[PDB]
Design a protein around this ligand. Structure first.
Ligand SMILES: [Ca+2]
Ligand SMILES: [Ca+2]
Ligand SMILES: [Ca+2]
Ligand SMILES: [Ca+2]
Ligand SMILES: [Ca+2]
Ligand SMILES: [Ca+2]
Lengths: 102, 102, 102, 102
């Protein structure tokens, strides 16, 4: 039942490009690295990993998932300051691209 | 006595319009879209279903509520990336409207 | 040992005023209401209520507490969208006023 | 394997300076003061104390950790309103900083 959101969401507003949404490319790399780490550091599954990853840069909210080891705890601190930005502008450009599509 | 909030709130300052507080229009569809999905997929009640939908763009804070199923995990990201921007500009406009309302 | 911050921060940086930090008045007024509701509606203590109030618009996070009544659940939903923008601007003005203090 | 994030990230683009990244200074002093407080009041390990201290500026989400004493609740409100804007402006400057590196 998500077909409306996936196709008319974070695939629709992608096909709308200036140069400083090279930030969605930067997000991709910090989010995927983060996902790669959380799977391996924290033992979690991919989806749970990508969930927690995105959860530290948006208001969204980690479920049960949160770090348990010093390594991932510190990593989350370092990553948390880097991704906070990339999300913010991707949310903004993505948001206007909704209203420009109406 | 939630009245003075809902009435001197979402109703009162929600009627200060440019062309671009048609964001509220874009929002209402996206919160609604999410609420239908959460009710049906996650099986939650409408209010709790809405509670989670409004949670993923705002610092409000999701309850015990988090997605338990893969679709509800996946969908929560795609929705969460788009709405977070929609939530903000609307939240700014209303806040802007409270200050010039005294 | 917080006597340092309360004087050095919370009551430091407010003693600096433009036109727009009329926004503190409105934020002040929104939070007092919200707290009163929770103590009265949701039975919690003044701080636990006052903490949840501040939890919803800033990212800090509520620990244990989450509203349990359908009534208080909506109250937070409505109250959430109003207060967030006031949080932004008082939080932003106040932070710049630290940097102009170094 | 966080080395790739730590060196390629929260120091590699941390050292990209205008006048207005004097906030990173102000962040370091306030983030430190909090961590000291949280270590002392809340009994927590320094790491966890730093994990909560950052959790409240950023979208991260504290773990199962949260202020359980009244002082530490009283403290967190005052500190969250001060430190949130600093996390914000640094998050952008750091964000602009990854994109300027392409
Ligand atoms: Ca949050
Ligand atoms: Ca989160
Ligand atoms: Ca949370
Ligand atoms: Ca939230
Ligand atoms: Ca919060
Ligand atoms: Ca947070």
């Amino acid at each position: 039942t998500l077909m409306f959101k996936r196709f008319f969401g974070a695939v629709r507003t992608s096909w709308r490009d200036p140069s400083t949404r090279g930030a969605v490319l930067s997000l991709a790399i910090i989010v995927t690295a983060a996902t790669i780490f959380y799977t391996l550091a924290e033992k979690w599954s991919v989806i749970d990993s990508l969930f927690y990853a995105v959860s530290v840069g948006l208001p969204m909210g980690n479920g049960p998932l949160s770090p348990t080891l010093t390594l991932s705890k510190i990593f989350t601190l370092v990553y948390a300051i880097l991704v906070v930005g990339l999300f913010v502008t991707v949310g903004g450009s993505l948001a206007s691209a909704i209203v420009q599509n109406n």
